[PDB]
């Protein structure tokens, strides 16, 4: 497997912060982006359309068995944890139906666990606004493999819970307001 990957975790106010990130990335962004946004079943598709309409990158819902490619932003669908698997030098998504991690599924911790193991030091985690601690254990894995972690600054958060939890463990390499995140991503890849 070549290149890097960006895995974003978000909850409360997630869409608002993503609006300051995704639309500001070039069509030729070299790393595939995966977004795990906490939301009741049946709403993740609305998010895909919302972001696809304002972005140069192609935003869609992640599909089972689909190949993870650059130039795309994949939104995790409801009812399943979004996994990643490496096969013959390529990376594919898989819908896992194991227990809820928190009272949440998909949980960004599951996606990051899989992504980190595959991409290792080339893994980039972004933990945005939201309640709870989802993204913290996932950030641990990312750092354990030499990856990089970005936590959203309180300034642009609706709820400074998820990013704060990541920061308090010492897992954040960068603490940035949503609008500065796209710029940081562009220089890291």
Swiss-Prot record:
Its EC number is 3.1.1.61, 3.5.1.44. Keywords: Chemotaxis, Cytoplasm, Hydrolase, Phosphoprotein. Phosphorylated by CheA. Phosphorylation of the N-terminal regulatory domain activates the methylesterase activity. GO terms for cellular component: cytoplasm. GO terms for molecular function: phosphorelay response regulator activity; protein-glutamate methylesterase activity; protein-glutamine glutaminase activity. GO terms for biological process: chemotaxis. The active site is at 11, 38, 134. It is found in: Cytoplasm. Residues 1-189 form the CheB-type methylesterase domain. It catalyses: [protein]-L-glutamate 5-O-methyl ester + H2O = L-glutamyl-[protein] + methanol + H(+); L-glutaminyl-[protein] + H2O = L-glutamyl-[protein] + NH4(+). Disulfide bonds: none annotated. It comes from the Bacteria. Contains a C-terminal catalytic domain, and an N-terminal region which modulates catalytic activity. Belongs to the CheB family. Involved in chemotaxis. Part of a chemotaxis signal transduction system that modulates chemotaxis in response to various stimuli. Catalyzes the demethylation of specific methylglutamate residues introduced into the chemoreceptors (methyl-accepting chemotaxis proteins or MCP) by CheR. Also mediates the irreversible deamidation of specific glutamine residues to glutamic acid. This is Protein-glutamate methylesterase/protein-glutamine glutaminase. It comes from Thermotoga maritima (strain ATCC 43589 / DSM 3109 / JCM 10099 / NBRC 100826 / MSB8). The lineage of its organism: Bacteria, Thermotogati, Thermotogota, Thermotogae, Thermotogales.
């Amino acid at each position: 497997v070549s290149g890097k990957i960006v895995v974003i975790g978000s909850s409360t106010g997630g869409p608002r912060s993503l609006d300051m990130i995704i639309p500001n990335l070039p069509k030729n962004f070299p790393a595939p982006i995966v977004v795990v946004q906490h939301m009741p079943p049946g709403f993740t598709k609305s998010l895909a359309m919302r972001l696809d309409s304002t972005s140069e990158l192609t935003v869609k819902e992640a599909e089972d068995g689909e190949e993870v490619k650059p130039g795309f932003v994949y939104i995790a669908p409801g009812d399943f944890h979004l996994g990643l698997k490496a096969q013959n030098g390529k990376v594919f998504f898989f819908l896992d139906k194991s227990d809820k991690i928190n009272n949440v599924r998909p949980a960004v911790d599951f996606t990051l666990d899989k992504a980190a193991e595959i991409y290792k030091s080339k893994t980039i985690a972004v933990i945005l606004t939201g309640m709870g601690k989802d993204g913290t254990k996932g950030a641990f894995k990312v750092k354990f493999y030499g990856g990089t972690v970005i936590a959203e600054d309180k300034e642009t958060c609706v709820v400074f819970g998820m990013p704060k939890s990541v920061i308090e463990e010492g897992y954040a390499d960068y603490v940035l307001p949503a609008y500065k995140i796209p710029e940081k991503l562009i220089e890291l890849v």
